[PDB]
Symmetry: C3
Subunit: 30 residues, 3 copies
């Protein structure tokens, strides 16, 4: 259960990193 | 132990992500 | 190997975050 939750958190963080990289690229366009 | 250390790392990472998102919010509003 | 894989994921995330923090500094930087 603890392991399931930690892996879920890792996936959510990677999801945010992906989101961040797209935001940064949009800012650079300009 | 091992699992505990992994949780501290994940917790510190989450703070860094929150700071980055806010910085990005600030930049898009002309505060950076 | 499974727990080592989780530790690799964490080290990779840390490298991505440091690179992001550099990119944000570069977006912000002026001639100061």
């Amino acid at each position: 259960g603890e392991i399931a939750a930690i892996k879920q958190e890792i996936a959510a963080i990677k999801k945010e990193i992906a989101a961040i990289k797209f935001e940064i690229a949009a800012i650079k366009q300009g």
